[PDB]
Structures are given as structure tokens and as C-alpha cells.
Amino acid sequence: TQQPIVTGTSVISMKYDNGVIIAADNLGSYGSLLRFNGVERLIPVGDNTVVGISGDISDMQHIERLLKDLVTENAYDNPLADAEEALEPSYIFEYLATVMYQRRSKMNPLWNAIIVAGVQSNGDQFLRYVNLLGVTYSSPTLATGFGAHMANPLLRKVVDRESDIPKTTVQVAEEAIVNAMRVLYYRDARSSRNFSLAIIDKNTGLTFKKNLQVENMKWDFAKDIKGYGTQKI
Amino acid sequence: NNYDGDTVTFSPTGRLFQVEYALEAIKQGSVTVGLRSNTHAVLVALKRNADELSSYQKKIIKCDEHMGLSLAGLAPDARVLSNYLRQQCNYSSLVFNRKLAVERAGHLLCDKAQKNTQSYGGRPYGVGLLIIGYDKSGAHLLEFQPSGNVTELYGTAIGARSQGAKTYLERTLDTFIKIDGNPDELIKAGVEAISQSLRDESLTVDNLSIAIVGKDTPFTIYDGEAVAKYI
Amino acid sequence: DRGVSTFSPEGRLFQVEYSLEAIKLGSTAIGIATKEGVVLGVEKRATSPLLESDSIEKIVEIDRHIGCAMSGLTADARSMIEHARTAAVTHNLYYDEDINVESLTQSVCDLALRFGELMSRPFGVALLIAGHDADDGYQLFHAEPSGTFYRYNAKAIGSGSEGAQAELLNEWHSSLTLKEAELLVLKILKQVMEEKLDENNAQLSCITKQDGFKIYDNEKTAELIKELKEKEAAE
Amino acid sequence: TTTLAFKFRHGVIVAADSRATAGAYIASQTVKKVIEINPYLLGTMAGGAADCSFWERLLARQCRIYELRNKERISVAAASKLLANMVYQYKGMGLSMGTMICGWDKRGPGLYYVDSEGNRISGATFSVGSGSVYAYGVLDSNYKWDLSVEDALYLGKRSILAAAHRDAYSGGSVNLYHVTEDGWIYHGNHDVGELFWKVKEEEGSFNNVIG
Amino acid sequence: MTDRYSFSLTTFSPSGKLGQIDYALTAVKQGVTSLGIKATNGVVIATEKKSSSPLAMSETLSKVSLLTPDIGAVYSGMGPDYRVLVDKSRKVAHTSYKRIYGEYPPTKLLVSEVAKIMQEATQSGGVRPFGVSLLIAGHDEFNGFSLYQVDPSGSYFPWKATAIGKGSVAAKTFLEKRWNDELELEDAIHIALLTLKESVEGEFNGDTIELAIIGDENPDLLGYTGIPTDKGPRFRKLTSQEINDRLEAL
Amino acid sequence: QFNPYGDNGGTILGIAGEDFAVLAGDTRNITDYSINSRYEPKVFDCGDNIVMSANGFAADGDALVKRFKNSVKWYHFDHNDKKLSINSAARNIQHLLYSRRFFPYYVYNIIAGLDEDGKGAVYSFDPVGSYQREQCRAGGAAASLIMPFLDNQVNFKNQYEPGTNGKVKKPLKYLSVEEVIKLVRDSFTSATERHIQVGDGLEILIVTKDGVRKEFYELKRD
Amino acid sequence: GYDRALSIFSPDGHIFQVEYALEAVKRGTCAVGVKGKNCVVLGCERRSTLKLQDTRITPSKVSKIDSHVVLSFSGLNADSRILIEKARVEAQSHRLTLEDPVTVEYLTRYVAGVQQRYTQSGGVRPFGVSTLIAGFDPRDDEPKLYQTEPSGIYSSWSAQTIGRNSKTVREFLEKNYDRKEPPATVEECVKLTVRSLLEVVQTGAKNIEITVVKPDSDIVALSSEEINQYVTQIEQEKQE
Amino acid sequence: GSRRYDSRTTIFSPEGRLYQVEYALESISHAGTAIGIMASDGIVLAAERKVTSTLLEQDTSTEKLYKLNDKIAVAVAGLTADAEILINTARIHAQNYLKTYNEDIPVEILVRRLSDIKQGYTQHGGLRPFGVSFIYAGYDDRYGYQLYTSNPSGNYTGWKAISVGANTSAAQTLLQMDYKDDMKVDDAIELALKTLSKTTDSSALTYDRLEFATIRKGANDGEVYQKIFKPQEIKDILVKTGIT
């Protein structure tokens, strides 16, 4: 049993017709202090998987090392390591899910919420969640922390059920994710303007975008707001 | 001679006699054949009886839905090694949601057998195994020796009089490899291969044991009247 | 000296082969499987007339549906029986059912090769495990110290085994009744035994689906011996 | 829960209700709280269903290997003692069991009370569970050694009914057993709803209730 | 790996002999001569510093060792075995006595502990006996001055005077003629030097001889003042110069 | 302080027929007042004509099912591909549950299939292994909403025959699979109305001698 | 730990260490057991090579395992103490867990199991001891007499002897003991036990020990004079 | 591996003897003779030190006679180092018993415990046995004065008079001749010294070659006193009995 110290906030994601999108801001908070501004919380595994992590950053860095070691170990005595016997999103997820549940069962958890996004060998989209309790679930849209409360409602307006996935393009899906990140910057007190975004497509592969910023923000209406009720000046 | 008392002792010519004696137990064992195409992989085994009142000792063991083996030598040692394979196949599924690659299954058996050849007190395994399976890179056939040596092959045979079946497969190499999408013809080639190792006795209904795995075929064993079709 | 788990140049474990020689010195035990049941019979072989023969326990219950006869160093069989009984009852605990005869035999045979430098040597006793289950019906198994087990229609182990097995070769057929099997075991036991066969120096038992495993009374066996004598004198 | 058992001239009667509760919610009304250890041995369940079920089924397996080893049926005293020693290892760990071990052995009919606290008591009459307090009134007032099997079966049935009526956590149905030297005999499942009205009419009892 | 020698390497032969102990005693016989003499007001222990090479600094190799402030030791036989026994002897004096009773052990009980360690090497699995005989001189309040010999078997005997190693038979005869119960410490040192000269071939001086005494308390060697009851160690190693001074009056 | 347990909501329902059995459960997964998934399967085909659902804490439910599927696999290996009967599976599951008596699987488990006589069978489990065979059983969040309805409409409780006035009960006539599925759908539709953790979808697994069949029905998404 | 396999098979199928343990039993002093109609008598030889012995304190040959069961032996004396201690511990453990004293058959089965365990365990040698275990089961009047040996086999006997010259006394018992009519009284049973030892013992003075066990935990050891009266009567009848 | 070098200390010979026990007894037969004699009013322990030297410090020396507690003492024959291991274990056992039951340990119970330890080294562990034979002299309120012996086999027996070590055959014959049941301590003292004087391999029996001890109720009223004799006291008793 511990408490989280340096933390990362929401990770958000969704499926679209040819793949998946995932995003997360670049902040490492220390309670109410916005301490570390250059923290990458999306970690690619090969060219077909991206693991997005929220929660304790020290435990994130530990998981990041486990994944790096997993790739090394998979290549051992494996001539098809870059082909048929490469790591799949489903393999990577089940491994983490196994680790998370085992750690909670020893009353010493990895204080994280994780979303594994990727595309399988057969072109199928993979998107599944796991957390410190070992709880797992899958949905067309997935989000952690505040994203669950604010992002999911917006992303579910695009993909409300399974049948909406083929009807959703990459441009529409990215637009929805970027909008959600803006909303989280308006409303989450432990968020940052700077974020990373990753697209895993079955045709165009893995596209990893860094140093993105929330833009097209609405603040001008603030000038007209005066006092808390009766004040006019 | 003076260097065969235990597994921990090299001979003056660099030989390990206890391992060689374990290898001898395989040659005493009943014949078993393995062969594959690009779509399927087949095991054929000649079972042995104690007498006319006795049953015919089982030769083939299932390890997973996509993998299994045939044995020749000490049957209990095959039970130990197959139990290990069952666990490893199972660890791969539970932890990684991943079917164990046949090549990696061979590497694990090699390493398990090796530990018994370098340490004092223990003994080498006294059995040879032919592992077949269908994984993400297609059909596979492996040969396991208790020295630790594992080899991927198109076809092979181990046990008594296995040289006859091995020569046949070496001639038929170009033919049986092309038998794709036809399980019965691939088994026929295996039954014809094991027939080259027979003397005096012939293939009867409770004598023959066949197993197959493939693209849309789980590892299944055929015994009794199920193999009368191929006699 | 030399390792306990050492292979011979022929590819056999010395200790396993030597334990098989000890089993050849043991008293005779015979098993016959039929569609009406499996019969088990043993030679008691008391070393002295003062020895109370009814205390000689070479036929043993493992469960209601599984029996067991032994031959060789019979003291070694006690821990095997104990394991078998535990395995049978434990499976009933975990699965609310009777355990398959083959599965029980496999569990006993797993102990066999657990020796090295675990126990210090192989078992010096062979077992005839007879029983019934719903899947494979009436069954008879021969469990060796090699860890190998063969199923048999009929089998003899002990000192008069090869002579008895040849006799079982000719006499057994798939339509044998239980009564015919009882007399057949008595006949072959009488043939290979040193002393004259009676109810006190030989013991019968059977396993049926209805009544389960039963060791025969000396009064019941005595009648089967008298029935045997008369039918041999009939021609 | 209401369970009872008592020794008498012609063996031992064993009776129990069938209600399982989860707070105020009635989870089940078809619970077998009498356990068949062996054809000459019974065990009752009260408190933790999981605990009582597991340890008494593990007992039955202990009692069975005893029979194979010793060519003899285990005594009620020895069986009760194995259970008591088993649960004593986990004392303070949170086990919740209130059981009776009922049977007939060489010493005649036998009845032992065993719980997770560590008590193991031999007695002619027991009742355990939340509704035991109601059952004891009917038992103590009508219990004799010279009881017929018919009257004894009714007494155990009537005693459960008394508790099922008053105790909110007891009810559903009554399971009856009679243990003889030739083994236990099951005497059926009796719905309390139907049984209550029947007893009310035939006996005249429960006048305060309208029917 | 694992130490798989869990069986005894020293066993009884048909004649009743414990071979390895006898062979250890043979190794002691080959060793350089060392001796001990007990006086009325002290004890002396002495040996030859057999230098393996003239380039070797023999001062760095100490054959005579302090075990406690009032107990010293010398040996004959295998040097490395002696060195580890001294390490263990120093430690056991603390762990099995000083940390319990708050004072240093009496000579006989420290000897008893060393003896035990040597006996165990004679019976325990996968070890050979120690190839040394020890001479342990010491003083304690209630037993006074004492001198003990300890053999590879673990057996120990108290001596008025004795010798072990190369020329022990001749040296013990020499000591029998010279020893009496009225000897002062200086007389014992003189006899020790006379006895030791007979077994030495080459150079015989303070640089080739190692000699120490158990005698009066040395407050100058204590290292601190302020506690009346602490009066300093009775063990003292004689210097090269101090030995040479007594070789002129020899 | 770290709490190793959670509540993922969900509700399940098992009904045993004369020669069939159904195991139904909603597809909604939740934490607190949030929805995790509108379609997260909760009832599984475990092999040997046995279906299973472990409702409550999803992580413990997934582990138990995973372990039972594993137990079935090894039962085939160890006992010559013998079919695991429903009564044998039930007893095995108790021992899986009680192996964690002092750190329980926080789930309410139900399995369904056919007994060895071919009749429909449902077994119900508490978190620590107490089990029993039942004809009708709901488990999980809205269990208390559904069970009283099933007592009335499956076992005809408190129902008597008109004209007799409480003297003669309504006879226990058997139900068909089509009649049972109607009761299942009405149970979940009613539970959806009054329980916030119930909704989104309903997946039913029907077991017969022919095998395991599935049926899916939408539920309200509010 | 010392794991060496000392008890192993030889080419002819013999475990020599177990067979050499029987030779230690052959060297041991003679012990005899005879069961009558309502009693069991245990006779034991005392070798008269050892005089100046204190017979008060010297370990007696017959040991009580419980109030109703006794154990005598032949072979290594030190080994027998280990089996007796284990048997005594088990006897109390049985009373403690099952609330009944051990049956004679159960106690024998335990001791025999211990002996067997030492024939296939690493780092240990077999017990050089054979035992005679006698007594009466709780609430039973049927006499019980069992024998064990180093290999671990055990069996029930109407009458039996073990130790040195046991071949001779067994010969005597086989012709003198009638199964249809066993020693009806204590006198007849003791007399037959003393007679059997007189075939081997030498002098009938302090060389013969006798212990009578009767039902319901009635165990007593005869004195020198009481035994000497049997020795006197036997030889006076023999002079004819 | 290591098997090659294992002597196998715990095995039977074809004749059913324990090799190492027999060879340990052979060792003990060369050790100095120790004698124990039990009288009605006490026990005597006498023992011969092995070929001593004039330069041996006798008054502070102890190789034969050891104190286990206030009521029990032992005479040693064999390897002294091996004996001290066992002696310390026996001292601890006596104190354990006293702590547990608040009563002094009965003699036989202490003897059985030590003998069981010796037995263990002959049956398991693969180690050589202790090359030691003890004579136990002790008193308790159950059996009174008691003499026991134990040897490397772990077998123990009770005695009126007994010898261990060298020349036991000769010594036992002499004791068997002159011993009587109504004997007293002063007479037993004389018998012990006379027996040693005749069986000794030395030219003459002197004070410096002996260890001597008595256990007497010759303590003021109902209690027992152990007397380990000093060199001068052994010299006086040698003159008194008329040996020197």
C-alpha cells in the first residue's frame, strides 16, 4: 500500500474505421503543483501499439521499462520478431493486466490507469483499459480520470455504438479527440495545454505527434462577467 | 567405461556416455513417424503391446489445441516433458493471450533436458519426442533428443527400425510437402512411411495410432476403428 | 559406487531392472477381467504354521469401485495404497464423483520414478489394480516400479507368472462369466503354488458394479475350491 | 437459521430450516443445512454457509479414508473431534460455524455440538442458530427418552416451526432426518407456509394468528 | 553447486585409529619448534621466525598472537590454519563470553572454546582437521598464570613447561632438567632462549626469534588513564632489542 | 489506504428448463456513476456444454472464469477427455472459491447447463464457495428486484386456482424456452427501469443437448 | 543434508542393508511370544555373560507402549529405544485425536511403517530390530500377538519367537502349540513359554524374563522366584 | 561427484555389525582404564591418566572425571575432545529438566538422553560416531545410588561394578571375584585401587597417574556430596590402602 506522488491526469482514446487514436497531456503534477512540463505519457510498443498511462509517474516509468524489456525478450530466438511473431496489442495488454492484478493481490499496486491502443495482425482495432485494481473493460471510446467524465460523452456522440465505427473517418476522430483535450484544459485543474497524440492505422501505420497545443480557445466572454451577482462595475 | 558412472563426467574423447545410454533407450522404443505439408502436420505411431491380453501402450500426447507430440523410449519421461509443455503452452495463453510458437516450445524442451546433463545426482531423460503444431508461421515438425538437441524438419522418424521410414520420407520430400488442403492424403503418406519400418507384424486396428493438426484442424488423436480407414 | 538414477549401456535404469527381480521372488497374484466383473486372487504363502494366515493382507480395497492385489516386497506397497486411497477420496472431494481406474493407476505410477539422491530407491512391488467406472467399464491394470502401466484382460505377477500367463493365454475369452473366472484363478493358483491350495493359504476377491469391491470369505472360497475339484474330476 | 437434534430411545432426530439471508434480503429458501457425511453420519450447518459446507465435506473425506485404513466406520466422537481440531487451527481468523455431528456407532446414538469458537460438547439435545432460542422451549417441554419415532419426528418438526414463525432469519421449509443403527433416513421437505396452517388447525396452536 | 560433502572425512580405521588426526599430528611434527614455560610470576612463549625469503619482511608475519589482553598464543605446523584459528579465537572470546559477562574469559575456558572448534573440524562434514598444535599462555584473577597445549584432535592439557614441533622431544628433556616451582619470569625467559637455541640452525637473534610474555600489568600499554581498576594488558611481545640484551647475558 | 476491491455493477439470471437452461446477464460495466462499457460480455461458454458468469468485482470475476476454463482444460488432460458434468464443475468451483477464504473473490457466480439425465441445471455460488442447485436464480445488483418476480411467474408462488379460494395451488406446469426468454427479457426491462447499474444490453446464452446458442437484446441506455 | 542412498537393490533383486539388519536381529537375545485363550505371555532371554549387573535399573527387555499394549524385541538395543519412543508418542497422539486407545494391529502397523520408511529414505540405515507386539484391544477379550521386522512387513501369530536360536524354539512351538486348544489358563501359557526358552537359554536362573498381559490393561512381570518354580516343575516332570 | 569420497559411516556389515561402532570400541580399548563401584552407602569412581609427564600441571588438569551436576558424575574412556562435546550437552539437559520440573534429573533419564544422541550418529547423518565410553555415577530419590555405562553404539546398561577402557576383561574378572552386595564405600575405594594396580600397563601405580572421585551420603544428614579428589588426597588414600 502506498500513495501516488507525481501524477499524470486523463488519457483519452477512441476507435475509427481503419484504426484507433489515443492522446494524453505532457504534465507530471505534484499535488496542486504543476511540477514537470515535459513528461511523455504515451509509450509506443513496436509499430502497432501505443500504451497510454495515467496515475503515478514512478510506476509509469517502471511499466515503461517492463515494456522495453518485453520487446527485447520477444526478439530472443525469434526469426519472425519483425513479422508473424511480433508483439500484438492483445499480448501487451494481457501481460500488463496480469501484472496489475497480481500487484493488487499482494496489496502493493501499480497506482495507474492504462489504455492499450493498437491494431492487430488481421487489421482489427484493439482498445482496452486496465487499472490498479486489475479491472479491465473495452469500449469504442475509453478515457481515464477526468476524461471518463468529460471526454467520453463527447467521443460517444461520434461513436455511440459498434456500428458507428466504420462510419467514422480519421479526420473526424482526430477532430473529436483534439476538441476533448481542449475541454479538459478548460475544466481539469491538473491538466496542461501541451499534449501528445498517436494514431495507429491499419494502412498508414503508426503516426506519433508530439508538442501539440490546445488552440482556438474561447475566453473573450470573460470581460463581460463582473462580480458574483449584484456588482455592476 | 570409467567415465559412464554419472552424467557429470566427460570421457577422454569428449563424450557423455550417460546421455548416449539414454539415447539408446529411444532406439529400443517402438517406431513413430512425423511429417508435414504447408497446411497440416501429421504424427503416425506404431503402438506396442506386452502380450495378447494386454493393451497397446499409447504413444501420442496432446499438449494444446494447436500442439502435441509422439514418444519413443521411457513413457514416464514423456509424461513429465509433455506436462511441462502443457504448462508452458498454458502460461503463454494465460499471461500473453498468445499461442506458444512451436519453435519456442522446442527451445524450452532443449533447455529443460540440458540441465539434467550438466548436474550431479540427476539423470538425462530417456525418451525421444516428435512435436507437431500449427502456429502463426504455419505447420511445424520438431524432433527432440534428450541430449538437448532439437531440430525442425519437414519429416522424420525415431525408434526401432526408424531408418527405413526416414529414407522413404527423404525420397518423397517433394511430393508430400505439396499435399495442401488434403488431410487424408497426408496421413496416407505417413502410414506408407511407417510401413517401411515394419517386419513380421503389420498395421492392425488396435496397433496403429495417428494424430493431425492444421489450419482449421485442432490437434486430434485417432485410435481404434477411426484408423481402420487407413489400414 | 555409482548413481541410483544411472542408465545401463542398453538404455535401462539399473535400479528399476533390479527391483523387477525382487518382484519375481514375490508370491503369485492373478487378475482376470470379464464383462460381469474383475476377479483378483493371491497366494498367501505363510512362512510358518503358527502364523495366523488371515492377517496376511495382499488384497486391498482402494475405493468401493477399485481393488488392488500386490506381489514382491509387500511392505513397500503400504505407502502406494495410502496414496491411492488419498487420491481416490480427494478426487471425490474436488469433483463429487468416482475417479477413473486409469486416472487412479496413473496417480500411483507417478510415484514410481520419484527416486534419486524424494525416496532413495524404486518400489520393490508390483500391483494389479482392478476396478469399474462408467466410461470404460471393468478394467485391470498392471502397475510397475518403472512408472509404466499396461491394461490387461488377464494378468499374473510374482514367482509363477510366466507359467500362469501362458495358461491365461489359452483360457481367457471375451464371454467369460464371473463364476468361470473365479474357478480359473483358483485353477492357475493351484497349478503354480508350492503348497496345496486351500481356503487358508489362498484368497479370492472381486469387483462388480452392483456390490463393489469384496474380499471373499474363507467359507465362500472353500466351496469354489470344492466345485473346482469336482469339475476337473468330471473329465 | 434454526437447526436441532436430539438423542432418544430409537436413535437421533435431526431437523433444520432452509432459509439463507443477506441482510434483510432473503437470498434462498431451499438450503440444505443437513449434510450427508456418510450413510451413518449427519452434520448440521449454521452461520457461514461456505465455512460449514467446505469443512464438513472435508470431514466426510477424512472419515472415508479412516474407514479404508482401519476397516471400520469412524465414531461420532472421533469425527466431531477431527472437525474441532481442523477449525481450531483457524481460530480468530474469522470462521463462522455452528454444527452438530449426529450418528449411530458402537456406543449407540451419538450427538456432538461443534463450533468455530472451539467448543465440542456431547449432549442429548441441541439447537443452534438465530432461532434456536424459540426451538428450545418446545423441545424442553415435550422431550422424553421414551418417544416414538412418529412423535419424535413431529417434535423436531414442530420445534423448527416455532422458530420459523418468530425468527425473521428462519423459515422456508423443514428438512427432517431420522438416524438409526441401520443408517439415516430422510423424512422429506416440508414447506413452512403449508405446514403452519396445517398445524394451526390440527393442533389448535397459534390462536393469535388469523386463518 | 551446494556443499555436497555432508559426510565425515575423518573416520575410524579397523585398528581404532583416526587417520586424519594422526596425519595432522605428523604435519605438526614437521613444523618449526615452539615452546612455553610457566614461572611463579609469569609465563613465556617463544618460537623461531623461519623466514621463507630474505626479501620477505618477517616482522609482518606474527607467529605469536594476542587473543585477549591477558592471553597469548603460539603454534607449530601449518601457518594459515593458525591464522584463521586466531581470528576465530579472538571472536569467540567476545561472542561467547565478554558480551555476556562484561569481562574477558579465563585462560582455561578460552582454550576450551578453541578446542571445541578444532574437535568439530575432526567430526563435521566435508572438512579436514586443523594441521596445528597451539600453545596458549594466559592469566586470570582466580586461576592465576597458566599454560595449555591444544592438539588437532581438540584435546588440551595444562603444562608447567613444554615444547611442540620439530625438536620437541629434545626440548622437553631440556626443560625437565631446568624447570622448578620457584622460577622467576626472567629465569624462565633465560631458559626459553637456551632451549630454543638448540633447535635453531642459522642466525639466532632478536630479528629471527619471536618471544612474548604473560606477566605484570602494563599501564603504559593501556592507552588511557582515569579508571583505577583498569591497569593494562599482561600480554607483552618482547622487542628485537629486548631479546638481544638477554642474549648477551646468555 | 488501498482498497483492493471494487464494484462493476451488473446483474445476471439463470433459469433451468425441462431439457434446456439459460444464463442471462446485462452487458453494462460501471464504476460509481460512470459507464465504462455498454457492451462488455459477462456470460461465457466454458466448454463441455457449461456456461458461467461471475458477477460483482470484474477483476475477480475474470480471474475465476479464467481459472475454471483452465480447470476444464486440465480435467480433459488428466482424465482421458472425459466430459465434466455440471455437478462436478460446481464442486470444483467451490474449491476455487474457498482457496481464497481469507481474501475472497468478490463475486456471485452462476453456472448453467444440463445434468447427466439431460435435464436443465442451474447452480448458484456465494463468494466463498457455498453452492446449491436451483431452478431459478438472479444474482448481482438488481437480484432483489428480479427474484420475487420469478418466484411468482416461474414457481407460481402465492398463486391459487380460482373458485377454490386458497385451498388448491396453481399446478407447477413446465415452461418452454420461448416462455422463459420472455420472462428473462421482462425481468431485465423492469430492472433497467428502477436500477441505474442495469441497462445498455442483454445477452442470453441458451444451453441444450445440441450445444450453446446466443441471443442479444438492446436495453435502455440512460 | 546427508542424502546418500544406503538401502538399494542389488543385481539379484536384494536390498542387502535390510538383509544385514536381519543378521543383527539373529545376533540379538531370544524373544518369544505365546497367546493363550485369555492372555498373552512374552518371554525374553538375558545373556549371562554380563554379571555384576544391577537388575533394578538395567533397561528391561519388555516395554509398555500403553497401559494395554507391550513391545519386546531382538537386535540392536539402541535402535529399539527409537521405535519404542515413537510408538509411545503415537499411542498418546491417537488417544488425543480419536479419543480411543490404539488397537494392537494399529500400533503394529505404525511401527512397521516406520521400519519400512528407513529402508527407502536417503541418508539413513534400516533398524536392526524385529519386534513382538502384544496386548488386548480396548473393550475386547481376544488376545493379540504381532511381529515386525526391518523390511517393514508385519503379521499376526498364534505363537512366535525371534532372535538367536529362534529356529530351535520355533521348532518346539510348532509341535507343542495346538491351535484347536490353546493354553486355557495363565499357568499353562507361562509354562509353555518357559519350556520353549529352556530349549535355548542355558541356566533357568536370572536368564529368563516373563511378562504376562491380560485383558483390561492387566500387565505384570513375574519375579525370579516365581519363574524358578516353573523351571523346577518342568525338569522334575522331564526326569521320567 | 562427492559420492566417490564417502566412507559411509552408518552401514551394516554382512554379519550385521556397525563397522564404525566396532572400530570406535577398538579405539576405546587403548584408553586409560576407568572403574566404577557401587556400594550401599555411596559410589566410587577411579581412573588412570595415560602416560603422563613430570611437567604436566596435575592439580588444574582434568581428562577422566567430570561433573554433570551436583548429584551425577562421569568417568571418560576415549577421545577427550569428543567427551567434552557430550558432557556439555548432558549438563544442559540436566538444567533443562530442572527448569521444567523443578526437580533434579533422575540419573537414568540423563543417561538415556546421551545414549540416544550417540545412537543417532550410528543410524543417520553420515558422520563418524563419538569415540567415547562413559561410566555414569549418580544418585536420585527413586533408585538411590546408580552406576551406568554407555558406548558409541548408544547402548546403555546398569551395574554394581564395572570397568571401561583398557584391560576391562582382566579388570571385570577381579571385580567379579572380590565384590559383595553388603560392601561399603571405604571397602569399594580399596577394591577400585587394587584392581587398577593389578591391571595397569605402568610399572607402578602412583598419585600423579590417577583421578579419583566418590559420591557419598556421607554429607551432613539426608543429602549427597560429590568429592573430586585432589592430588595430595589421592596420595594419602594410596598410602592408607597400602599400595605405596
Ligand SMILES: *[B]([O])([O])[C]([C][C]([C])[C])[N]C(=O)[C]([C]C1=[C][C]=[C][C]=[C]1)[N]C(=O)C1=[C]N=[C][C]=N1
Ligand atoms: B442461518 O441463518 O445461520 C443461515 C445458515 C446458512 C448455512 C444458510 N445463515 C445465513 O443466512 C447467513 C447470514 C446469517 C443470518 C443469521 C445468522 C447468521 C448468518 N447468510 C449466508 O450464509 C449467505 C450465504 N450466501 C448468500 C447469502 N447469505
Ligand SMILES: [Mg+2]
Ligand atoms: Mg438503466
